[PDB]
Structures are given as C-alpha cells and as structure tokens.
XYZ file of N, CA, C and O in Angstrom:
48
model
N 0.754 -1.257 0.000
C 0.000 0.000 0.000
C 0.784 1.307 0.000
O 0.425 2.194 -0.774
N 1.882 1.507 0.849
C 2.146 2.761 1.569
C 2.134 4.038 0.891
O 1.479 4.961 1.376
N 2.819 4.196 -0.225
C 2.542 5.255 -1.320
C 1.207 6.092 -1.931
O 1.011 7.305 -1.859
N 0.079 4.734 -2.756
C -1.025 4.845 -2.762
C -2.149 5.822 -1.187
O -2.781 6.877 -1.238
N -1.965 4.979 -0.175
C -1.454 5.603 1.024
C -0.600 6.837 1.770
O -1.348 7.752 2.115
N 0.664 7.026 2.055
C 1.014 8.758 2.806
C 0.447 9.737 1.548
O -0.102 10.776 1.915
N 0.514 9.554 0.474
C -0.234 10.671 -0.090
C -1.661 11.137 0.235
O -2.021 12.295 0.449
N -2.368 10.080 0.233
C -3.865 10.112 0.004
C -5.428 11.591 0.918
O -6.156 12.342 0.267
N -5.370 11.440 2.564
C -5.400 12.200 2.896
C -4.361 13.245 3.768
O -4.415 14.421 4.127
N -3.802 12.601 3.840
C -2.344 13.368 4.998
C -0.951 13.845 4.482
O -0.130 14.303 5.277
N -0.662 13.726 3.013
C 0.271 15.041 2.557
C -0.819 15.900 1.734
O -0.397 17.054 1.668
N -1.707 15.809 1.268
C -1.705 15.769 -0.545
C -0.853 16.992 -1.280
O -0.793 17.051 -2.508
C-alpha cells in the first residue's frame, strides 16, 4: 500500500 497511502489524505 504505503505510497497509494502517505499521499492520500495526509500530505496531498
């Protein structure tokens, strides 16, 4: 997952 994921709501 993780990529798909830290982007998603919490950098964008």
């Amino acid at each position: 997952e993780a990529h798909k994921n830290r982007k998603l709501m919490e950098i964008i």
